[PDB]
């Protein structure tokens, strides 16, 4: 098996206040089962992220060396890593998660039969054969238990057959017998020859008896490294008395807590386990798949997540149908009189600002899947471009095509707008473009963040500053010229100007007029063009289509900013 042998690791970060969180750590990890103990604030998870190259090579100041050689560039694609909180797809089943991982991690050369036999072998080794085709589980659907979610998360990284297998906290978040079952599974894996390296948090003695090698850390300094049975005898030789009926790992943490660390670290420097470790270390020292493949599998997984999550996808269509029926019931039969201007401008304003505010629920998209994106980009399933295009083609495109089609098909014929063939399609296309553009601004603000609330609030602030300049509330010509340049930034202004220019052309709003008051008395606003001029809207068809080209360019700019915020994200 592999022998991961790290020597003289110094590590430091910038919080810019610079601080070392690993001081001087060396150790050898045999084929077998290697554990890392310590407090939360100690460097246990930091050292585990360092050995799997999950932290940036800028701060790392020592050689990490496997089997006699430094770590190659293919190492992250070769050595699996298992996150603390599970990143499995809750809506997909256990076989389809392994199908996804086998499709992206393994080569394109292999047969589907070979990958299916590999998945069957991996799901046989885990004991997930009873639940091989049930859903993993979310809030709305009941699913598989937490220990079998953790076995699924291990099995996703077992597909590529890793030589070294890392594990961040496989015990925590679980109950006791569940944790013992997971660790007995890990021991059965480690007897094969696979080198398991894991960090944990306050284990039991039934856990602690299983360990092959131990590494204790505290406040960034190495406290012990040797075989795990030898550790209690070493701390008896250090002078700390162990009491009867006490867990030795709890005794190890009780040494750290003080019933000092610079006093206790130097005691390990004067050990027999330290000179032997240096005597071993100085002996040793002195993409895969194409683009369309990644886009197809990412888009397939995200669409299957969209079907398997029924509530936030179906409920938007239900609210769209109900609100379309309500707007068809209130504005029913738009007349051509003095109320016709107010009703038509009001319903077009409601439809565009409804599209804008209903596109706030796409903040959720790149924020819920953030840790899964980081883990799967470092582990090397896909590029950022294929993730981005797959998750646009999957979750953004149909869930913004369908509500705008439903709004136009419902509120068009109940209201009785301009009864032409193409005006219907221009209205449908304008609502679809304002939906895409508002949702693309949502993705531009929301991508690469961890919380939903600040991005949602910022979207709503931007929209209430756009709807002032939309043109119903203020007249755009009466804004001062040092402030009227902000009207180009606003998406409802383009959607609403396009809909007003679509609908107000052939209409007359003075019944029985036939020039009674001599082109009626200069204050009438009778024909639709006379309204549409004094709003500041052009009458030529470029006055229609410049709104759509402005929306298309805002889609392109906002999706490019969203892509650059995903691409320049701190992945480590």
Ligand X SMILES: CC(C)C[C@H]1c2[nH]c3cc(OC4CCCC4)ccc3c2C[C@H]2C(=O)N[C@@H](CCC(=O)OC(C)(C)C)C(=O)N21
Ligand Y SMILES: CCCCCCCC/C=C\CCCCCCCC(=O)OC[C@H](COP(=O)(O)OCCN)OC(=O)CCCCCCC/C=C\CCCCCCCC
Instruction: Fill in the per-residue mask, 292 to 321: x = in contact with ligand Y (CB under 6 A), - = not in contact.
Output: x--x--------------xx--xx--xx--
The stretch among 96-104, 109-117, 357-365, 420-428 that binds ligand X (CB under 6 A) is 357-365
Regarding 461 and contact with ligand Y (CB under 6 A), the answer is: yes
Which tokens go with 218? 């505290």
CA–CA separation, 199 and 189 (whole Å): 17
Query: Which residue pairs from 370-377 have beta carbons closer than 8 angstroms and sit at least 24 positions apart in sequence?
Result: 370/448, 370/449, 370/450, 371/83, 371/85, 371/87, 372/87, 373/566, 374/569, 374/571, 375/81, 375/83, 375/87, 376/87, 376/104, 377/571
* Residue 24 interface partner, choices ligand X, ligand Y, a second copy, none, CB cut-off 5-8 Å depending on type: none
Burial 254-275 (b: 16+ CB within 10 A, else e): ebbeeeeeeebbebbeebeebe
Q: How far is the CB of 350 from ligand X (least distance, A)?
A: 5
CA distances from 460 to 120, 207, 350, 471, 571 (A): 48, 51, 16, 18, 28
291 binds ligand CLR (CB under 6 A): no
Of the candidates 158, 143, 149, 160, the one whose C-alpha atom is nearest the C-alpha of residue 84 is 149
User: Cβ 387 to ligand X, closest distance in Å?
Assistant: 24
Q: Residues 122, 323, 455, 526: which binds ligand X (CB under 6 A)?
A: 323
Annotated binding-site positions for ATP: 38-45, 142-148, 169, 201
Spacing of C-alpha 406 from chain mean position: 29
Q: Name 64's bridge partners.
A: 6
355 and 404 Cβ atoms separated by less than 8 Å: yes
List binders of ligand Y among 222-281 (CB under 6 A): none
Any contact of residue 473 with ligand Y (CB under 6 A)? no
- Both tokens assigned to 125: 């080794």
Q: How far does CA 359 lie from the centroid of its chain?
A: 18
89 phi/psi in degrees, rounded to 5: -75, 120
Task: By CB under 6 A, tell whether 325 contacts ligand Y.
Answer: no
Q: Which of residues 432-491 bind ligand X (CB under 6 A)?
A: 457, 460-461, 464, 467, 473
Per-position x/- string for 402-421, each x denoting binding to ligand CLR as judged by CB under 6 A, each - no binding = x-------------------
For ligand CLR, give the closer residue by CB, 201 or 300. Answer: 300
Contact residues: a second copy, CB under 8 A: 39-40, 175-177, 180, 202, 204-206, 232, 242-248, 250, 253-254, 257-258, 326-327, 329-332, 335, 338-339, 342-343, 346-347, 349-350, 354, 357, 464-465, 468-469, 472-475, 477-480, 483, 510, 513, 516-518, 520-526, 534
Query: Which residues of the shown chain bind ligand X in the complex (CB under 6 A)?
Result: 315-316, 319, 323, 350, 353-354, 357-358, 360-361, 457, 460-461, 464, 467, 473
């Amino acid at each position: 098996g592999a022998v991961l042998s790290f020597h003289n690791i110094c590590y430091r970060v910038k919080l810019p206040v610079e601080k070392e969180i690993l001081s001087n750590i060396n150790g050898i990890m045999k084929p077998g089962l290697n554990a890392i103990l310590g407090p939360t604030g100690g460097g246990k998870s930091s050292l585990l992220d360092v050995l799997a190259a999950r932290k940036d090579p800028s701060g790392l100041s020592g050689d990490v060396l496997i089997n006699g050689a430094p770590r190659p560039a293919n190492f992250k694609c070769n050595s699996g890593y298992v996150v603390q909180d599970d990143v499995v797809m809750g809506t997909l089943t256990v076989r389809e998660n392994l199908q996804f991982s086998a499709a992206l991690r393994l080569a394109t050369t292999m047969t589907n039969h070979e990958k299916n036999e590999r998945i069957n072998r991996v799901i046989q080794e885990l004991g997930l054969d009873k639940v091989a085709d049930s859903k993993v589980g979310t809030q709305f659907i009941r699913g598989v238990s937490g220990g079998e979610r953790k076995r699924t998360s291990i099995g996703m990284e077992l597909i590529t057959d890793p030589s070294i297998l890392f594990l961040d906290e496989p015990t925590t978040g679980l109950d006791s017998s569940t944790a013992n079952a997971v660790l007995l599974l890990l021991k059965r894996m480690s007897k094969q020859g696979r080198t398991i390296i894991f960090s944990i948090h306050q284990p039991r003695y039934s856990i602690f008896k299983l360990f092959d090698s131990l590494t204790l850390l505290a406040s960034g300094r190495l406290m012990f490294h040797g075989p795990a049975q030898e550790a209690l005898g070493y701390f008896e030789s250090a002078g700390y008395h162990c009491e009867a009926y006490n867990n030795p790992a709890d005794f190890f943490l009780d040494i750290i807590n003080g019933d000092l660390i610079e006093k206790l670290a130097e005691i390990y420097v004067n050990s027999s386990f330290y000179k032997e470790t240096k005597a071993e270390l100085h002996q040793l020292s002195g993409y895969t798949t194409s683009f369309c493949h990644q886009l197809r599998w990412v888009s397939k997984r995200s669409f299957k997540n969209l079907l398997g999550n029924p509530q936030a996808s179906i409920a938007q269509i239900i609210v769209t149908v109900v609100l379309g029926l309500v707007i068809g019931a209130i504005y029913f039969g738009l007349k051509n009189d003095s109320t016709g201007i107010q009703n038509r401008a009001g319903v077009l304003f409601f439809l565009t600002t409804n599209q804008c505010f209903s596109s706030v629920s796409a903040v959720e998209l790149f924020v819920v899947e953030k840790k899964l994106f980081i883990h799967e980009y470092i582990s090397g399933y896909y590029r950022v471009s294929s993730y981005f295009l797959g998750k646009l083609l999957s979750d953004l495109l149909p869930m913004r095509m369908l509500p705008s089609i439903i709004f136009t098909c419902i509120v068009y014929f109940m209201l009785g707008l301009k009864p032409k063939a193409d005006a219907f399609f221009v209205m449908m296309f304008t609502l679809m473009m304002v939906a895409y553009s508002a949702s693309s601004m949502a993705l531009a603000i929301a991508a690469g963040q961890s919380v939903v609330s600040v991005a949602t609030l910022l979207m709503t602030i931007c929209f209430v500053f756009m709807m002032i300049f939309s043109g119903l509330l203020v007249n755009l010509t009466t804004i001062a010229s040092w402030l009227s340049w902000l009207q180009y930034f606003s998406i409802p202004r383009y959607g609403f100007t396009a809909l007003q220019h679509n609908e107000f052309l052939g209409q007359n709003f003075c019944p029985g007029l036939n020039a009674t008051g001599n082109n009626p008395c200069n204050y009438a606003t009778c024909t639709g063009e006379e309204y549409l001029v004094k709003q500041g809207i052009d009458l030529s068809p470029w006055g229609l289509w410049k709104n759509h080209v402005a929306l298309a360019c805002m889609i392109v700019i906002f999706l490019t900013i969203a892509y650059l915020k995903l691409l320049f994200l701190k992945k480590y």
